[PDB]
């Protein structure tokens, strides 16, 4: 029941400033009131983050995803390499009741969409291997970080109530780990899922690079500030 649209989803490819967003907890170790220097894959400070206002995009090492969501229009994500039955495809969906994660050789239509009046973006689902159900993830800022290392899919998340008009706030907020998946896939491209009524969405995307950061832990073990060590010389 998947039909291609007539009008093109030619969202404007704007650019904007990353500022100091996209810092997550590197591990599960408690530290109190200490400065710790760690090297990992992060989003560089004051980088160029792409603004969309839904083509296939490369995955690279990791992905930082952000959305100034109003009324929960985004619904899911699709991950894979060939995006057909030839290779395992990861599908993540968040409907009202719960969240569903599947690893199957789906046959996706060229213009997937969730439909409203459950899933009709794939013609068929065969040879299923992994399934998972959990609580729902979701004027709100939703930030997610997706990483894939040695057969492990790490998803970090954060929700923030914001009231600023247009751009990403000038502030700091660490991302806490959300889910880990022990599944071996070699994802290279991804997509976004929209549940639109048959009768124009904005988000922000950035890529991660390896570098070293200096992190500050307060007394209660929460990350409060960070320093990029490859920037203006003062940072070094």
């Amino acid at each position: 029941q998947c039909v291609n649209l007539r009008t093109r989803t030619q969202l404007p490819p704007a650019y904007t400033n990353s500022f100091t967003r996209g810092v997550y907890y590197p591990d599960k170790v408690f530290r109190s009131s200490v400065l710790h220097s760690t090297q990992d894959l992060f989003l560089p400070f004051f980088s160029n983050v792409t603004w969309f206002h839904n083509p296939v995009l490369p995955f690279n090492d990791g992905v930082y995803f952000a959305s100034t969501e109003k009324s929960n229009i985004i619904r899911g994500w699709i991950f894979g390499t060939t995006l057909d039955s030839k290779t395992q495809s990861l599908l993540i969906v968040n409907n009202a009741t719960n969240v569903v994660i599947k690893v199957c050789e789906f046959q996706f239509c060229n213009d997937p969409f969730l439909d409203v009046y459950e899933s009709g973006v794939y013609s068929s689902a065969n040879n299923c291997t992994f399934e998972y159900v959990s609580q729902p993830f979701l004027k709100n800022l939703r930030e997610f970080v997706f990483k894939n290392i040695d057969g492990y899919f790490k998803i970090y998340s954060k929700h923030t109530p914001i009231n600023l008009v247009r751009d990403l706030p000038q502030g700091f907020s660490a991302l806490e780990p959300l889910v880990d998946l022990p599944i071996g896939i070699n994802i290279t491209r991804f997509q976004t899922l929209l549940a639109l009524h048959r009768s124009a969405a904005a988000y922000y995307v950035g890529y991660l690079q390896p570098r070293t950061f200096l992190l500050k832990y307060n007394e209660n073990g929460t990350i409060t500030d960070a320093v990029d060590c490859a920037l203006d010389p003062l940072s070094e």
Binding site: K28, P177, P182, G184
Partner: protein, 362 residues
Amino acid sequence: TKCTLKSFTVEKGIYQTSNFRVQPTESIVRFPNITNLCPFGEVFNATRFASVYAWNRKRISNCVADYSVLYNSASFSTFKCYGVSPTKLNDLCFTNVYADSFVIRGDEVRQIAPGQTGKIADYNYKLPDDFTGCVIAWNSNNLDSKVGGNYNYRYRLFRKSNLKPFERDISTEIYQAGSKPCNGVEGFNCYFPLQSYGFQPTNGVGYQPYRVVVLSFELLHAPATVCGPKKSTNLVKNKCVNFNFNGLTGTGVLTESNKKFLPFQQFGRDIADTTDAVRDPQTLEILDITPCSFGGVSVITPGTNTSNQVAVLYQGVNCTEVPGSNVFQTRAGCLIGAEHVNNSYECDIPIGAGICASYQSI
């Protein structure tokens, strides 16, 4: 002291001889609650099984399974494990398991074996010679066999070639033994490849129905799935023991701590990467780790030329873990063999923290 100085005489003073440390008493292991058991009740206690050439295949992964309880059951006629022994199977594990279940005759129970040949072993089910896993068979005459004949069960009898390992074929094509083609109807040279079992309640052992389930394992590079459950002894505090909290091992003494772990951490370290607190996977409370006490020992002597009685000082050790005279506790440690007086004289043999000793007794 004489041995360390390598001499038969000793002058007055304090000397450092050896060291001292507390020895751990016992061991403990802590692991999270055992849950999400693999559902074998629908497999080994299933009402009905499939045909031999249409064996039911089940995929097992992402749960917990204990093989000791299954092995201990006496309801299984044959329990033959080839790759590993059933005892050590509960420790090692694999990234996926395949269960092949069917019903055969009691005389064909040994057909399902590595390097085995036969009608069933070549037309219905085939195993590799290097097969690793286990086979469990049990009689079901009172259940599978019927007084009117268990003709529902079927087996493959005719096929041009054999079967590959882990291959299932349910084709019902009319077998052509001879060269005469058949138009879908069996003739002189054509027979049905499939024949029905003839089980009865009274048929004898060997002709009785037998349910057989074969478990095989595979280790693809994917993260490890189901393993045997891990036992968890209780925890003891205020005693120098060694611990294995969820794969984090170390010695020390465990106490109650008031640190507040944010709801996703597991353990904490202070600086220079030394663990200080842990969270027990069952009670979900923060503990504290302190290294077991140690320190050097020293001997205070007035000289071999004068006497032969000495005093002993344990450095930086509380007077609670000493292992026959009065015992004194000082800011420098604990001291045995000397008497504490209220006077104050000139210092003879320095001890530390503002006190020292001399010979009078010591």
